[PDB]
Design an enzyme around this catalytic site. Sequence first.
Site, PDB file in Angstrom:
ATOM      1  N   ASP A  36       0.793  -1.232   0.000  1.00 36.50           N
ATOM      2  CA  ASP A  36       0.000   0.000   0.000  1.00 36.50           C
ATOM      3  C   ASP A  36       0.839   1.303   0.000  1.00 36.50           C
ATOM      4  O   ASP A  36       1.358   1.718   1.044  1.00 36.50           O
ATOM      5  CB  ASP A  36      -0.926  -0.047   1.209  1.00 36.50           C
ATOM      6  CG  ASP A  36      -1.858   1.143   1.295  1.00 36.50           C
ATOM      7  OD1 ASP A  36      -2.032   1.855   0.293  1.00 36.50           O
ATOM      8  OD2 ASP A  36      -2.435   1.373   2.390  1.00 36.50           O
ATOM      9  N   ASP A 220      -1.268   5.723  -5.251  1.00 42.69           N
ATOM     10  CA  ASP A 220      -1.792   4.865  -4.136  1.00 42.69           C
ATOM     11  C   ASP A 220      -2.178   3.461  -4.639  1.00 42.69           C
ATOM     12  O   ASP A 220      -3.255   3.270  -5.220  1.00 42.69           O
ATOM     13  CB  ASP A 220      -2.991   5.555  -3.448  1.00 42.69           C
ATOM     14  CG  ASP A 220      -3.639   4.705  -2.313  1.00 42.69           C
ATOM     15  OD1 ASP A 220      -3.277   3.514  -2.121  1.00 42.69           O
ATOM     16  OD2 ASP A 220      -4.520   5.234  -1.586  1.00 42.69           O
TER      17      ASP A 220
END
EC number: 3.4.23.46
Length: 374
Positions: A36, A220
Amino acid sequence: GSFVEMVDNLRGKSGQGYYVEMTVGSPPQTLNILVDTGSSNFAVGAAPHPFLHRYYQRQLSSTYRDLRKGVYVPYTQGKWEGELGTDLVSIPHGPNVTVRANIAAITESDKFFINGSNWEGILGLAYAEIARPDDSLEPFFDSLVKQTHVPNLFSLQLCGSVGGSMIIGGIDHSLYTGSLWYTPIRREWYYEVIIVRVEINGQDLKMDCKEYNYDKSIVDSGTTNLRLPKKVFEAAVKSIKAASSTEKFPDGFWLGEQLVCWQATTPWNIFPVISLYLMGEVTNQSFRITILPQQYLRPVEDVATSDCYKFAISQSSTGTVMGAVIMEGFYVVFDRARKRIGFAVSACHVHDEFRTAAVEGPFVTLDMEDCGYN
Ligand SMILES: NC1=N[C@@]2(c3cc(NC(=O)c4ccc(Br)cn4)ccc3F)OCC[C@H]2CS1
């Protein structure tokens, strides 16, 4: 050890994210961990949540150290809660090293784990400033660079059952074609960047470019969609609608509230390319990335009541998020040493015979600094 041994170290399923194998504790406990770039905590399941395959058992680890401190993380779509500690962490298909890293042992969560997924914690690769509970909690990658001679960068190739590569410490040149173009990291918290111009099928949206970064834009890998500020989303859809006139569709589709289906016969050709121009390394210089409908129209494989597709561009009130929709077109270099992020055409992106994802430059764009929000 080296970069060859890291190619193809990522796994997952469509819409469930990309995960890398890690080991924590001594003796080593194997866990799959969501990669992440949109957060900064290393946090793993530490209790038998019925949907986890595996979980971190602190009692079995000789090298575990309790930090005697809790952490509570609510976010928009969920929450986790846990106990801070440190332990020894290795990445089997990564560099040949062991490091002492912060670990949040997750003890309660809601809507955090995915029912049906093959991962059981998260590796936040962004910067200390957004670490929970605060920036004194050193993020994993910071500990890795400090404790070893692993260079301060990593790159991500996300392909899609999906796969890809996380090259830790460097760049593998076979994962991309053409050249890398770099955009500066505006501030080291999220991986913040600045978008300077947006085109649908060559046509500019002609918005105040500050709207593109309201209140920020980020890269992201922990988000599926390309997310756009509400005003920008409105203009883009209106323009995507105009260009794909051949067929009409309901309002619910554009909003990601219904799917739309075709026989085993998708006319990707009826759908426009989307280009984002990013601030370049040099004053008044930008470059553009272009994605196909193959990135923003996502097959929904799980429709039991019926080839359907979800429109994977959505409204944001948190700024632009270049999630998997964007990153699956590109090899993305997170060059932390030089405060910059590189994009090159990914050697594994899905395209057809008519069109390709592209990274092109240089272009001349003025007042690029004006596009940032303060
Ligand atoms: N960056 C993000 N980080 C998260 C977070 C992200 C995810 N991501 C995914 O499940 C995911 C990724 C890629 C694909 Br493709 C599909 N799914 C799961 C739990 C989380 F808590 O952590 C803190 C904020 C939260 C929302 S934003």
